């Protein structure tokens with residue numbers, strides 16, 4: 475599809491049995507999801523943005539479906555205010571910026 | 574142009590005769606530039622990000638040329654880690670997400 479930017483580019487994603495709304499975010503290197511209790515190994519990490527840093531849990535090779543496009547990659551879990559789909563997954567679903 | 578997302582979508586912008594690199598950021602409501610001098614009045618404002626809130630200076634009706642496309646809009650100036658072009662200006666240059 476084509477998504478205009480008049481409003482936040484929010485889309486439905488699927489991860490496990492949780493459907494969620496997430497921002498398609500070209501300004502995020504990494505995908506960062508609201509707190510959720512995913513299974514498996516993870517490692518602690520700190521990610522920074524406007525305002526400072528937050529502590530997250532890095533989970534690897536997690537399947538996520540974004541608007542019915544399949545992806546699989548690293549997902550950071552922590553106290554983000556908004557679910558963020560970052561470039562690591564945006565490339566996998568063939569997302570570009572165009573003007 | 575079409576811009577893929579294997580790298581950060583950084584572009585040269587021109588503002589007040591100065592060239593800067595800035596991030597095309599669909600996950601940002603607002604345009605936020607690192608500390609710099611801009612002419613005219615500004616209003617103190619606060620904005621929030623992944624790590625918390627910061628204080629910025631709001632400049633209205635500021636021309637920025639982004640990849641040779643003209644915008645004139647609100648530009649916030651403050652302690653952002655990177656220069657960010659947000660949706661307020663991305664829409665002005667006809668930018669969309671496509672996959």
Ligand SMILES: CC(=O)N[C@H](C(=O)N[C@@H](Cc1ccccc1)C[C@H](O)[C@H](Cc1ccccc1)NC(=O)[C@@H]1CN(c2cccc(C(C)=O)c2)C(=O)O1)C(C)C
Nearest residue numbers: 501502503522523524555598600601602603621622623654
């Ligand atoms: C309300 C709003 O739109 N806030 C924006 C914002 O912070 N947007 C965030 C997501 C968000 C958070 C809270 C509320 C709403 C929306 C997403 C941005 O794309 C943001 C841009 C950015 C990029 C780099 C540094 C600071 C800010 N992205 C991120 O926060 C993360 C941080 N990040 C990153 C990666 C590596 C190093 C660093 C450093 C050194 O700070 C940051 C990254 O790639 O994406 C501002 C930029 C205006």
